[PDB]
Write a protein that holds these residues in place. Sequence first.
Motif, short mmCIF file in Angstrom:
data_model
loop_
_atom_site.label_atom_id
_atom_site.label_comp_id
_atom_site.label_asym_id
_atom_site.label_seq_id
_atom_site.Cartn_x
_atom_site.Cartn_y
_atom_site.Cartn_z
N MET A 1 0.83 -1.21 0.00
CA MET A 1 0.00 0.00 0.00
C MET A 1 0.86 1.26 0.00
O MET A 1 1.84 1.35 0.75
CB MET A 1 -0.92 0.04 1.23
N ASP A 2 0.48 2.26 -0.81
CA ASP A 2 1.15 3.56 -0.88
C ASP A 2 0.39 4.61 -0.07
O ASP A 2 -0.84 4.66 -0.12
CB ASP A 2 1.25 4.06 -2.32
N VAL A 3 1.12 5.49 0.61
CA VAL A 3 0.52 6.54 1.43
C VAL A 3 0.90 7.92 0.88
O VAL A 3 2.08 8.19 0.65
CB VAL A 3 0.96 6.43 2.90
N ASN B 1 -0.47 -0.12 -4.50
CA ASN B 1 0.46 0.29 -5.56
C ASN B 1 0.12 -0.35 -6.90
O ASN B 1 -0.02 -1.57 -7.01
CB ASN B 1 1.91 -0.08 -5.24
#
Lengths: 53, 412
Positions: A34-36, A48
């Motif tokens: 997961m991208d933040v 992602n």
Amino acid sequence: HDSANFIKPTSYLAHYLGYAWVGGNHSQYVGEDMDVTRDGDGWVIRGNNDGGC
Amino acid sequence: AEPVYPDQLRLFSLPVNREEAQSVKSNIVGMMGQWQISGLANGWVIMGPGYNGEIKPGTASNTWCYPTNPVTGEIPTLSALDIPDGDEVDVQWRLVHDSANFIKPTSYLAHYLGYAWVGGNHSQYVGEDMDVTRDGDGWVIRGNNDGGCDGYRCGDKTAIKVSNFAYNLDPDSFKHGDVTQSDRQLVKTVVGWAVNDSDTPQSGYDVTLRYDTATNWSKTNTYGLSEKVTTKNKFKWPLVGETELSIEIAANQSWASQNGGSTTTSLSQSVRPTVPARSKIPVKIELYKADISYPYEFKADVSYDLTLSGFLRWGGNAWYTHPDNRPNWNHTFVIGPYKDKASSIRYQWDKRYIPGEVKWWDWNWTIQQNGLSTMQNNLARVLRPVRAGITGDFSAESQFAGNIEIGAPVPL
């Protein structure tokens, strides 16, 4: 940015309620890869999507 | 898990995590050649430009690392600069004509951010040969341009402007002197008596005088439509003969919108005497308009607005979009307490670890170009506290002045 106490529990809730594709392309598991990002006054967390699927 | 400061990242060719790499991804990827591949911790690989920064599982011949026991790089605090006492303009004069504590630090900041030609024609060095002038309510500092020069647009020099001074008074230091009045004009007076024929003191008396003044305004917009149908015929009628008969039917519609406002100022005065038993007391109230003046003094901390104006260098500058067409730029910083984000150096410096917050100046760029300690020492000097004693004079036109009196008692 806390994985064990925020990113995974939230991802599983979305999954259990029926939302599709809750995860990135470099893992077969829910809540992984997961991208933040910071956006205006809030934050966005999403899987992602740079590779193929 | 923890903030990552890009200036601490170290690439080797003999270890950063996937989560850390993503939070500062554009800094790591920026520091890479096109088509290059470098390793991360725990079996992950970060790819450079041309692979669009992809982070995937894999191996590499070289690794991105971050040190054990890193530092935060905060801006240091210096002791205060003491300026000899005077009025507001005298203290401002002394600050802007100080070369080592004001002119050079400010010139270097403009230089490090990318402003062109920060200096005069009689020196090759930054901040040298600068002229200072008084302009309206502020001051302008610019390089001297009386001789010739050699360079592309060398006649277009950068200006440093100083304005909007403010004071943080020490609470126990303020004093004022005599208050004088002039051009006094009467508004209204009242006189009267409070009479007590009872056997006890009485305080139940009140006389009040009040004066109010007000202004107002409004604007209105109106639009509308109308439709009409008419018919006309000729008939022969009894006794009257030929008659023209005309019948008309019509309808209309209209819409309107209004906005407005007002302001009111009010001043009032009261007298409420205590009157002894079997006695009377006279009272009086007066109201005037007058010009008011008085001297004052205090000790305080001095803050101001700093504005940089010039064009940005082609070879590189710190504006976050990094323009290359030499545009003319104007930016204001507040040297003092926080007011906003755009104008706060400390806010922007401290948040350099979050890419979504970089909306004005790129402070990671300035560190890469000049060194971390270089930038810390320059900014500590730019933001150094300033203190002075202030003397001065207050004046204002057409203010209010009054007088309330309770007289001596007269036995009944």
